[model samples]
Target: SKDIRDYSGLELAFLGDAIWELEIRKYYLQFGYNIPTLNKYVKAKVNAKYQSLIYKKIINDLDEEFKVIGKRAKNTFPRSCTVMEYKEATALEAIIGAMYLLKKEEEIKKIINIVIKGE
Candidate 1:
């Protein structure tokens, strides 16, 4: 699937956002969270700034492409949200869109752990 691979910078991020959202929704269901609450929680989790923080936190563990992807997003736009408050959220979504389609479930969650903290 071109959606599976063969994506460039932000295109990957765009797909990654949806991919991550689906993954999060599916994972949350294992704990018996219904769709509405799960959607709400996922929206809170997968935004750009939150994702950026996660990427940086796990920078040592992430490979070079991950770093490049994040840096590209950061450079392309100055996020409107504050670090202590809300994050721009879009870039994170884009990154989510990218990684989820291209990588393994374990690989995605290894990074996801940084964003969710717990639950």
Candidate 2:
């Protein structure tokens, strides 16, 4: 894989989160689900509280360095979350937003699996 050093902390979270949601929706797609159902599933999974849960679950998988990255994002990525359960949830959305905008489906799939595991 390429170095995540290519982007800023927030930007990396932007990309990381994009990859998260895309992969999440893709995971639900395996059940032959539709957009509305997928939307619900994604909403349930990526909600801030759930994201925090997931962050805890996968913290061990991430690099010691990236854990710091995720922590920083967890703090600064909110405010725009609106309906999101956590303030920093916006970082996750920003990542998804960027991936959709950039058309990176494969990486998106990877994030989905990471995101949809616990809650």
Candidate 3:
């Protein structure tokens, strides 16, 4: 198997996008919102703008391993937004991606909780 460790930021980001989508949808499902409403809520938080905000909040508190990956991910590019927001969003999602592959679901959940609560 290919080493996940050496995967490029773009590769991780591809999977990371799906991870965010799945978790965000699962989060909203318990509330029993209609499909459209659920989609709206998911989009609101899962996009670059909101993720950017979430990352800004917890960036300082993250462990060095995560920060290292985050920075690596961010170092890799967007439109209709500031460069900062787009970059940070990718960084956040990439963090989630790495955690998932590393089988760190608790870490995934805690970070997700932080994003949810901060909203």
Candidate 4:
């Protein structure tokens, strides 16, 4: 619980990748699409690029309310995303992971609204 702070943004991001994948899969499950189709869309939506976009959309909101996790996460970096995409996506992922650990379902629900049915 309190130890969540002990984890750096990178570690939270690691946990976030797994959690976000689970979230996308579960969101798709409600549609009951073909297994292949469901997995395919889930794969598309659960990627770093999409996550990066989502982060950009919500960046201001995240920065204001979730500065601790989101800010620290954005401060960290990774590969495959080339540059901006990866950093922004890591921000979203890290924030999500922190929300889960902090038991902030409301915050995550706001995020999933953006992910599951975003503009």
Candidate 5:
């Protein structure tokens, strides 16, 4: 496999976005909400604003490796959110992607918990 560090932030975000959505879906399903309610719940959390909030909350909690990845992502322009917010959000996604690539399930869970619950 190619070095995880070699992957671009956009690439990481691509994978991370899917992973995050899946987790959100899974989390909401545990509540046994209806499909329409589930969709709304997912949309509320998965949007750019929520994502930016997550990144801000957990940024300082990130380890050095993930911090570097976040920094690289921060340099890129995003399709939405303010430039800085987008960058931070991308950084959060990049960390998720890197964890996924490394097959680090426990790490992913911990980070997701921190992102969503700050716990």
Candidate 6:
């Protein structure tokens, strides 16, 4: 791809949501939880509120491009979340999607560690 910048925020979020959900699911699966337990674990980590909290924790570390994407996503209207939670969560998804498109796996691994594992 030439640049993910050409993609809409929702498009990026769509890709990002899938990637993040897979990562979260993979992390939880290591513990051998049942299906319901797995769903609960994924739900807790993947929601807007939890992602918003993660966004706060790593906000200072975001680069300029990521920040721009995040801001654009934040300003977009909400669908299923409160204004605050939706925006921040969208920002987080934007960052993850951008990084994925850029193939910055190490950066995303660090972010996942901080955001999901809090490590």
Give each model's clash number: 10, 10, 0, 0, 0, 0
Which candidate number would show the highest lDDT if scored against the true structure?
Answer: 6
Number of backbone clashes in candidate 3: 0
Clashing pairs in 3: none
User: What stretches of model 5 exceed 4 Å from their correct place?
Assistant: 2-5, 76-80, 115-119
Cα lDDT of model 2 by residue, 1-119, tens digit:
23344555466656656556666666677887777987898778756666655545554664454455455554544543433346345444444444444465554455555655444
Q: Residues 38-59, candidate 6: write the lDDT tens digits.
A: 8998898899988898888887
Estimate candidate 6's alpha-carbon lDDT, on a 0 to 1 scale.
Answer: 0.82
Write the candidate numbers in order of decreasing lDDT: 6, 3, 5, 4, 1, 2
lDDT of 5 by residue, 38-118 (tens): 899888878776788887777787777777788788774556567777777777787788878877767789866765573
RMSD of each: 4.5, 5.9, 2.2, 2.7, 2.5, 2.3
User: What is the per-residue lDDT of model 1 for residues 1-119, given as tens digits with 9 covering 90 to 100?
Assistant: 65425666567666766776776666666767777887778776656556556655665565566555555565322455565322224445555555566564576777666555665
How do the residues 53-76 of candidate 3 rate in per-residue lDDT, one tens digit apiece?
Answer: 888887778778778878877773
Off by over 4 Å in 6: 76-81
Q: Against the true structure, what is each candidate's TM-score?
A: 0.62, 0.56, 0.88, 0.83, 0.84, 0.88
Pairs clashing in candidate 2?
14-95, 18-95, 18-96, 20-111, 23-108, 23-109, 23-112, 24-112, 78-87, 78-88
lDDT of 1 at 30: 75
> Candidates' lDDT values, in order?
0.59, 0.55, 0.81, 0.76, 0.78, 0.82
Candidate 4 per-residue C-alpha lDDT over 63-117 given as tens digits, one digit per residue, 9 for 90 to 100: 3546667766765445556567877788788888777777776787788877767
- Scored against the true structure, residue 102 in model 2 reaches a CA lDDT of 49
The predicted structure with the larger lDDT, 2 or 3, is 3
